[PDB]
Every structure is written in C-alpha cells, then in structure tokens.
Design a protein around this ligand. Structure first.
Ligand SMILES: Cc1cn([C@@H]2O[C@H](COP(=O)(O)OP(=O)(O)OP(=O)(O)O)[C@@H](O)[C@H]2O)c(=O)[nH]c1=O
Ligand SMILES: [Mg+2]
Length: 215
C-alpha cells in the first residue's frame, strides 16, 4: 500500500475540537483517492498530515517517498512560464510539453510572441484565475514524485475545461501515479478508485462510487 490512515484523529490546537476524527482509508500504488466535503471539513488538513505538518493524536499513518503538492491557492513567482512550471526541477522538452498540453496551456502560450519565455509575476502579464490555476497544476504535475496531492486544483475553470483537464492530466498523463485529489465533482468521484467524503472532521462516507450508488 502507498498511503494508509487508520483511526486517525488530529487537532490543530491543543484542547480544541479535532480537525479530523477517526479517519480511515487506503490507497494502493497508482490509485486515485477523491477527497470531498464542505468548506472546513478537513480536506486540506488531511493533506497537511500526509506532508508531516500535522501529527495524529490517535491512529496510524503510512506514506513513503517524495510528495508533489498543488495548493488550492494558485501562485506564481517572477520568471517565465516555463520557469514557473519546471520550478527548479531538471528540464526535459518532452516531459514539459506533455504537461502543458495536458493542462491546455499550449493554447495560451502559443498566443505570445515570446512563447514559453513570456515573463510572469513581474508586472507585465496579468494572468486570469484559470491560467494561474493551470500553471500551478502543471508545476505540481511536472515534478517527479511518488505521491501527488492535488488540493482543489481546478479553480476558476468552467465545468467542461475542468472535465477535460481532469481526464487528460489526472487520469491519462498521471495514470501510473498515486494521486489524492481534493474535489467534489461527480465524474471525479466516479473515476476514483476510492472516495473519502469528510464532514466536520468525520468520515461521512468511505468506499467506491458504485457502493454509494447501491445505497
Ligand atoms: C489547513 C489548516 C486548517 N486549520 C483549521 O482546520 C479546520 C479545517 O480546515 P481545512 O482543512 O483547511 O478545511 P478544508 O476542507 O480544506 O476547507 P476548504 O478548503 O474551504 O474547502 C479549519 O477550522 C481551519 O481553520 C488550521 O487551523 N490550520 C491550518 O493550517
Ligand atoms: Mg482546503
């Protein structure tokens, strides 16, 4: 198994209310876990636990290897669009091109005279919310890792663009990779190997889309 949580309870503040309560799941290598739930349910906190920023007060956690994290808040640093996506990782033309195509950034980049050398984050170009989200997603996906933590990465995208990139990037380009995707969208839960729905820290549902349909 690649990631396990067993009876996990955790607190951000000593003596506060638990942010996660008796959470259970397992992800095998190469699978996709969808993590859903309302605002404040604990989804980002669950990712933080996997990244070692929050320790369990009860329960056990298993995860090994290197992590790539995509924040739900998209961000850009001063530099070219290519530099923002590679972000200090060694460069490979084929890998880079595959990521930007899977994130629909080829269209955006082709429109600039400077192409992949267009400069971001320095007062020239002002990116849309959807461009910044796809660049942030591409940055996380370009990075080689054992586990990809994609926290609501489709911000500002219309539902068809979100669907297309979920399929081209999360399902096809990343098909061999262990993935945790924070998302509420029905198709994403249906395509996931497992679903975890959080509500106020607790496991509202854990299982498969098919199991939920049978209920
Ligand atoms: C990430 C984080 C969260 N919290 C608290 O934990 C609860 C759950 O918050 P969440 O996990 O961010 O909820 P979410 O499911 O990701 O919500 P959303 O991103 O709005 O969909 C909230 O009390 C937050 O204050 C902290 O105190 N410190 C933190 O660093
Ligand atoms: Mg969050």
């Amino acid at each position: 198994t690649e990631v396990v949580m067993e009876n996990v309870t955790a607190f951000w503040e000593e003596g506060g209310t638990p942010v996660l309560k008796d959470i259970n799941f397992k992800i095998e290598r190469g699978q996709l876990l969808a993590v859903a739930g309302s605002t404040g349910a604990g989804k980002t906190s669950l990712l933080m636990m996997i990244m070692g920023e929050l320790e369990p007060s009860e329960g056990k956690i298993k995860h090994s290897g290197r992590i790539s994290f995509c924040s739900q808040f998209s961000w850009i640093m001063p530099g070219t669009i290519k530099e923002n996506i590679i972000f200090g990782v060694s460069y490979d033309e084929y890998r880079y091109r595959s990521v930007i195509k899977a994130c629909q950034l080829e269209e955006d980049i082709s429109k600039f005279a400077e192409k992949d050398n267009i400069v971001l984050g320095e007062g020239g170009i002002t990116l849309s919310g959807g461009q910044r989200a796809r660049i942030s997603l591409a940055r996380a996906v370009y990075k080689d890792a054992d586990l990809y933590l994609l926290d609501s990465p489709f911000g500002y995208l219309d539902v068809l663009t979100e669907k297309e990139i979920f399929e081209s990037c999360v399902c096809k380009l990343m098909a061999n990779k262990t993935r945790i995707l924070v998302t509420s969208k029905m198709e994403h839960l249906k395509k996931a190997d497992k679903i975890l729905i959080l509500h106020e820290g607790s496991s509202y549902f854990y299982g498969t889309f098919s199991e939920l349909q049978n209920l």
